[PDB]
Amino acid sequence: DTHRLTRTLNCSSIVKEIIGKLPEPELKTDDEGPSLRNKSFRRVNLSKFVESQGEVDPEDRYVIKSNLQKLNACLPTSANDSALPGVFIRDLDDFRKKLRFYMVHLNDLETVLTSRPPQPASGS
């Protein structure tokens, strides 16, 4: 009742929450998904990485991917045409810290990258 009315654009606080929920661990791992770091397709790539990373440690039990799926519902980035596997990290949290920063580093609050105007249709 004290949340968004139905469907608009209130997924910014959900990203800030994940940022505060995933700290900055660094026991002995790497950065995050290299091939999944795509500029505009990263959101789908991170979602697929989180599902497979839950196999390295039981830390994926934090059922928050659903909130990220809502973020994609609020911010347009569902480009499921680049969802492939790359490397695996030993600690989930380490990957989540880098993924949380890369998912928010996409741009700011509108589009990921700039593009050119078409001839027939207007903007996209």
Say if CB 86 and CB 30 are below 8 A apart. no
Q: Which residue range is the domain that position 122 belongs to?
A: 1-124
| Nearest CA among 83, 87, 26, 23 for reference residue 56 | 87
| Nearest CA among 22, 44, 19, 33 for reference residue 89 | 33
Buried b (16+ CB within 10 A) or exposed e, 6-41: eeeeebeeebeebeeebeebeeebeebbeebbbebb
CATH of residue 10's domain is: 1.20.1250.10
3-state secondary structure of 98: helix
Placement of tokens 């810290």 in the chain: 97
C-alpha span between 55 and 122 (Å, rounded): 44
- At position 117, the amino acid (one-letter code) is P
Way the structure was solved: NMR
Placement of tokens 């909130």 in the chain: 67
- At position 44, the amino acid (one-letter code) is V
Say if CB 29 and CB 94 are below 8 A apart. yes
Name the DSSP letter for residue 118: -
C-alpha span between 79 and 88 (Å, rounded): 22
Alpha helices in 3-115 (DSSP H): 12-21, 42-53, 65-74, 92-105
Buried b (16+ CB within 10 A) or exposed e, 64-87: beeebeebbebbebebeeebeeee
Name the DSSP letter for residue 4: -
Terminal alpha carbon distance of the chain? 33
Give how many domains the chain has, as a whole number.
Answer: 1
| Nearest CA among 44, 45, 23 for reference residue 93 | 23
Rounded to an integer, what is the distance from CA 120 to the centroid of its chain? 32
